[PDB]
Structure formats: C-alpha cells, structure tokens
Design a protein around this ligand. Sequence first.
Ligand SMILES: Cc1[nH][nH]c(=O)c1CCO
Lengths: 39, 156
Amino acid sequence: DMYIERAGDITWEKDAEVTGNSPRLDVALDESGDFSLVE
Amino acid sequence: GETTDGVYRVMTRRLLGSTQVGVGVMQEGVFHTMWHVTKGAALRSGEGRLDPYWGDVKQDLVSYCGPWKLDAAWDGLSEVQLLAVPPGERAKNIQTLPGIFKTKDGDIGAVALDYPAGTSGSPILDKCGRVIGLYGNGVVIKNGSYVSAITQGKRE
Ligand SMILES: Cc1[nH][nH]c(=O)c1CCO
C-alpha cells in the first residue's frame, strides 16, 4: 500500500548547482515504454 | 488528505522499513507521476485515498483524481532545472542544458543526470517554475551513464 508525503514547493532556484552534459542520441521507444539506443 | 500544490515522495511499507519508490507533482488537485512508480495502484495521502484517473504504459505516465494538467514544454534552447527528490535526502535543484532523444516520431528533450531509481517522477522545470516534464524514463549510454527523457503528458 503506497502513500505520499510532501517534499517541497516547485520553484526555480537562482544560482543552483549547474551540471550535466547535452548528448544528442538516436533512440527507439517500444510498446512497453522502454527506450533503447539505435545504431 | 494533503492536496497543496508541490512535489511529493511516493513511499511503500510493503518491503523492509519505509522505502521510497518514486516522486510526483500535485497541481490543480491532480497528482502526476510515472506509471513504473505505482503500476497504476491506488495511493494514500494521510487518511484520504487517491484513485487513478488516466494512465498509459508507453508514455510511462499516470494521473490521480483528475486528468493530466501539466502542459508546459522545453523551448529547445534554454537551461532547465531538475528538482531532484532522492530517497532519504532533501529536495535539491540541479540546473542543466538538456540534450535530445531523436526518434522516428520526433525529438524529445533529455537530461543527463544520474540519480537512484526511487527519484523517478521528479519534475523538470523552466525559468518560470512550470513543470515541462518528469524525470525517470530513459537509457544507459555507451559509458554506462544514465540519460532520462523529459517526459510530458497532454492536457486535454
Ligand atoms: C532504472 C532507473 N529508472 N529511473 C532512474 O532514475 C533509474 C536509475 C538510474 O539512475
């Protein structure tokens, strides 16, 4: 049995930690909702 | 139960202790999460009950108490923020420039940030604080890294 608990407001934080790259990938999406790489 | 707008953890007491299986967004009285988090099961909020209203395994999304309300989209140019809510840890904003998932049916924004599975459902926001999608359905690329789609539903 699942339950929910509040974790915070949804707001943009000025001067948040900036990380992560921006890859451009060819992908496929199957009927089960699973993404996979296309090569 | 609690219906204030905001981000929420999705918990279960079925396994050892209390385990966080995911995250979701409450907006306009509707709770939005990813299908793989709840598998369409009913949810509890205090003494109240939330029943599923719409869901789709292929989109990997589900809404409770009403139809999907989130309709903002990534502009394809700007940095966004993942409002990550990891298991047992405080909510934290991470800013990033999304990459792209190119599919036979069009392009989708993607966030190259790696968090525990129980973080699935965390919202990705634009500079106006609007939810442009949920984090947690993606792919593992060559170097073993994780890249999530920016998954957004349709507002009827
Ligand atoms: C398997 C899975 N689904 N969503 C997630 O965030 C993960 C773990 C990768 O950090």
